[PDB]
Amino acid sequence: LSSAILSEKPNVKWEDVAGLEGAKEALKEAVILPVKFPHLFKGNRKPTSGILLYGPPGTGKSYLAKAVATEANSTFFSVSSSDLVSKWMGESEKLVKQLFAMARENKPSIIFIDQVDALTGTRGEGESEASRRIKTELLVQMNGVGNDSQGVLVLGATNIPWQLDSAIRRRFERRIYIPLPDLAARTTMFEINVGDTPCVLTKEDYRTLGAMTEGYSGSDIAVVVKDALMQPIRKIQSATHFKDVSTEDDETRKLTPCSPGDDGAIEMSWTDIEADELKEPDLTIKDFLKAIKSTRPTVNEDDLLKQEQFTRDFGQEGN
Amino acid sequence: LSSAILSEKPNVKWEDVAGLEGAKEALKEAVILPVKFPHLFKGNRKPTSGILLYGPPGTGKSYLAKAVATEANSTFFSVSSSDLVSKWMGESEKLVKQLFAMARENKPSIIFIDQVDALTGTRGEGESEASRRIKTELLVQMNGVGNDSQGVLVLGATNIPWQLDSAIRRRFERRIYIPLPDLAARTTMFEINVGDTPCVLTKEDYRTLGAMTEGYSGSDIAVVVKDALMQPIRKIQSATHFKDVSTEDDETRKLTPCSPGDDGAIEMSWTDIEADELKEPDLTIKDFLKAIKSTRPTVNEDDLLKQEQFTRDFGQEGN
Amino acid sequence: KSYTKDELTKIMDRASKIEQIQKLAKYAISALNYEDLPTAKDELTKALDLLNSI
Amino acid sequence: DRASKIEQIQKLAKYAISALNYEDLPTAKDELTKALDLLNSI
Ligand SMILES: Nc1ncnc2c1ncn2[C@@H]1O[C@H](COP(=O)(O)OP(=O)(O)OP(=O)(O)O)[C@@H](O)[C@H]1O
Numbered sequence: 001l002s003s004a005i006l007s008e009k010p011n012v013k014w015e016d017v018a019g020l021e022g023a024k025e026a027l028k029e030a031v032i033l034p035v036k037f038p039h040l041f042k043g044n045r046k047p048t049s050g051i052l053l054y055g056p057p058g059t060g061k062s063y064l065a066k067a068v069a070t071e072a073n074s075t076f077f078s079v080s081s082s083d084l085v086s087k088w089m090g091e092s093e094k095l096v097k098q099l100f101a102m103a104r105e106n107k108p109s110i111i112f113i114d115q116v117d118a119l120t121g122t123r124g125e126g127e128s129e130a131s132r133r134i135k136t137e138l139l140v141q142m143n144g145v146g147n148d149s150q151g152v153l154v155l156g157a158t159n160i161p162w163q164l165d166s167a168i169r170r171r172f173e174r175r176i177y178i179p180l181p182d183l184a185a186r187t188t189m190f191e192i193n194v195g196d197t198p199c200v201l202t203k204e205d206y207r208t209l210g211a212m213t214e215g216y217s218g219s220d221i222a223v224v225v226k227d228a229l230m231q232p233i234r235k236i237q238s239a240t241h242f243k244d245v246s247t248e249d250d251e252t253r254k255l256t257p258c259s260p261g262d263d264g265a266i267e268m269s270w271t272d273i274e275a276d277e278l279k280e281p282d283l284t285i286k287d288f289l290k291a292i293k294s295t296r297p298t299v300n301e302d303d304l305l306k307q308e309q310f311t312r313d314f315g316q317e318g319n
Numbered sequence: 320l321s322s323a324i325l326s327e328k329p330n331v332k333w334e335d336v337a338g339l340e341g342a343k344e345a346l347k348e349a350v351i352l353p354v355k356f357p358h359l360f361k362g363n364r365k366p367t368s369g370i371l372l373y374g375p376p377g378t379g380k381s382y383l384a385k386a387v388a389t390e391a392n393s394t395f396f397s398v399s400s401s402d403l404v405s406k407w408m409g410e411s412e413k414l415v416k417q418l419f420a421m422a423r424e425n426k427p428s429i430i431f432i433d434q435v436d437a438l439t440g441t442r443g444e445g446e447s448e449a450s451r452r453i454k455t456e457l458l459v460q461m462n463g464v465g466n467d468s469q470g471v472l473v474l475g476a477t478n479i480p481w482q483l484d485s486a487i488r489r490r491f492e493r494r495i496y497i498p499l500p501d502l503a504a505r506t507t508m509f510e511i512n513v514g515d516t517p518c519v520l521t522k523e524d525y526r527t528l529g530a531m532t533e534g535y536s537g538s539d540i541a542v543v544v545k546d547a548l549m550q551p552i553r554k555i556q557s558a559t560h561f562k563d564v565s566t567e568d569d570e571t572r573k574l575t576p577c578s579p580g581d582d583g584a585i586e587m588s589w590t591d592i593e594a595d596e597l598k599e600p601d602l603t604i605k606d607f608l609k610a611i612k613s614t615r616p617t618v619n620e621d622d623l624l625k626q627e628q629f630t631r632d633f634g635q636e637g638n
Numbered sequence: 639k640s641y642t643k644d645e646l647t648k649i650m651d652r653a654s655k656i657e658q659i660q661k662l663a664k665y666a667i668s669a670l671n672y673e674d675l676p677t678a679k680d681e682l683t684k685a686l687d688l689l690n691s692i
Numbered sequence: 693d694r695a696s697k698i699e700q701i702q703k704l705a706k707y708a709i710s711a712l713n714y715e716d717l718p719t720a721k722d723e724l725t726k727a728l729d730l731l732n733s734i
């Protein structure tokens with residue numbers, strides 16, 4: 001009857017998310033503040049219970065969700081439009097009922113629906129059969145709890161707001177556009193993406209890095225980082241000639257890839273080199289440059305047309 | 320519930336494939352390196368997650384997949400987009416969910432999805448029934464186990480990258496163009512496809528062939544090969560005049576097809592003919608000549624322009 | 639530290655040049671595997687002159 | 693003879709590539725030049 005859907009703990013902190021922290025503010029005020037100081041929400045002021053994030057794919061909407069999950073100290077349920085919401089006939093809606101029952105049962109709780117648009121209908125076969133009655137079930141269930149007392153939060157996500165029908169829109173609470181990262185956000189993300197690995201940590205070139213990348217997503221940035229990270233590895237694979245660097249003051253000899261002509265340039269397979277004696281080329285700007293070169297114009301303007309149109313019309317709008 | 324997928328070994332080695340050794344390297348790094356040295360993935364060094372193979376039909380995409388499976392040294396899952404389309408109209412994606420569960424439970428595993436431009440075709444209006452739900456199911460399920468602990472690699476295959484949506488495009492990672500073979504690659508494939516037949520000699524003939532046959536696929540090459548191999552059988556069938564060649568030191572007079580005018584031309588048919596006394600015609604350039612006459616080019620150059628356009632746009636990287 | 643931000647152009651250019659040289663070398667090796675000496679010579683010459691120009 | 697000379701050429705190419713991988717341009721130049729001269733000598 002019930003069918004439990006994951007409440008696992010990601011480990012993504014607030015600080016791992018760079019950018020437009022007004023959304024973060026809305027989150028913290030909508031979730032954490034109610035928990036922390038409940039007496040602030042008595043009488044005619046009642047806590048916000050619906051939030052839905054929209055924008056191009058790859059912009060950490062899912063990442064943001066995981067951060068929220070990490071930060072909530074609450075039950076976090078997460079489910080898609082295909083996930084546990086069908087049958088022969090009929091009882092998907094019942095499953096939805098049982099779920100929201102369970103949500104009420106567990107205060108605080110958070111329901112996260114990715115790709116909320118995929119639960120929509122106004123004319124087709126789903127409007128005749130299921131998807132209408134699904135939509136109706138949703139609408140009715142988001143009605144009464146929103147009146148007066150609630151320990152459930154509804155979190156939406158969508159790339160395509162405009163294909164989600166008008167019926168949900170005004171009945172739902174709070175919506176924010178998640179744009180692609182700007183210069184500063186890209187730069188911060190670079191720094192975050194470097195972590196512990198040493199050389200080069202040039203603070204001055206980070207801003208050049210964020211400059212050079214324009215319009216790319218979090219995902220894209222991640223990909224470029226990974227791409228740069230395999231460069232020393234690919235060197236090693238193509239490397240033959242290695243040489244000692246760590247002196248006898250250290251525990252033992254340690255070999256790194258080196259120019260083929262050098263005094264101490266001995267040639268073998270990288271597979272012969274064990275982990276204790278192991279050393280890797282440093283990370284240069286050149287590695288990152290190469291990484292950028294494999295990255296192309298990633299994001300189509302066509303997204304920007306409709307996403308910026310919805311932005312001009314609704315945007316930071318609650319909806 | 321399970322829906323049985325074969326993971327057995329299609330014994331096709333690296334060396335049986337010709338070309339794009341750089342994609343081969345990416346694959347070696349994507350599977351083999353993880354297998355060989357997993358302890359190299361502490362900190363910010365993390366496995367590649369998804370690779371799309373894109374290009375014209377018939378370019379050994381399936382062949383490549385076989386080689387991957389042979390070389391993976393792990394559980395390998397293979398599926399066509401034909402599979403798991405629908406059962407009732409209601410229930411499809413549960414099978415996808417269960418599939419991914421199975422794959423997650425087998426680390427390392429590799430999922431190969433053929434013709435990812437099917438499911439996900441994509442065209443509007445008609446998508447809103449089950450197909451949008453599927454589209455969603457992909458996107459959400461790739462988000463599930465993706466962070467931290469991965470033993471899944473996703474390989475897609477597509478003929479039509481340009482109709483695969485933005486949403487998949489910059490979520491699903493690394494995209495690689497599989498071109499038609501060039502002169503070199505064709506020649507190498509010719510040399511690969513020989514068998515026991517002594518045939519026509521040297522490399523000169525091979526290079527002549529690979530030069531002369533242009534704009535054709537591995538599949539097409541295979542077809543031509545089979546044709547040529549059957550041509551002596553075709554000679555045997557159509558000419559009932561045969562003649563002795565080998566000396567009496569063998570079991571008996573060894574008989575091959577000849578013209579009705581030929582000296583020694585006996586005209587009994589294949590039916591009376593003993594297993595030992597058999598002399599197949601040698602494989603000549605003329606078989607390949609007639610094969611070329613029979614070989615028509617497959618793919619229009621507009622498709623080449625669209626593949627080339629995508630390549631100009633996204634190319635040898637995911638984006 | 640120490641970066642004027644106009645170097646990156648030259649750097650990526652020279653990197654592309656290096657890549658092209660590497661490609662040329664590979665092609666030459668391929669040509670040698672096909673006992674095609676003149677092609678090999680031409681590709682190595684083109685790599686050589688490409689190397690010389692920077 | 694023509695087999696070992698090709699092998700030597702290949703080796704020299706490999707050495708040039710290693711050199712380039714570590715931005716040792718003069719070494720690369722000299723190794724490509726030796727490969728080319730040797731190729732001409734075949
Ligand atoms: N500060 C950041 N901003 C944006 N994205 C980030 C950031 N840090 C990490 N990421 C990336 O976010 C990805 C998580 O998925 P993401 O949120 O981008 O999907 P999405 O945009 O929600 O699209 P979908 O709705 O299809 O899941 C990770 O793979 C990671 O590389």
Ligand SMILES: Nc1ncnc2c1ncn2[C@@H]1O[C@H](COP(=O)(O)OP(=O)(O)OP(=O)(O)O)[C@@H](O)[C@H]1O
Binds near residue numbers: 376508
């Ligand atoms: N190096 C190669 N390049 C291209 N094709 C090859 C190569 N080696 C073998 N083949 C051929 O590949 C064929 C296998 O099917 P193939 O992978 O070409 O279909 P496909 O490219 O997946 O097309 P589709 O996506 O329409 O199924 C075999 O008939 C085999 O002869």
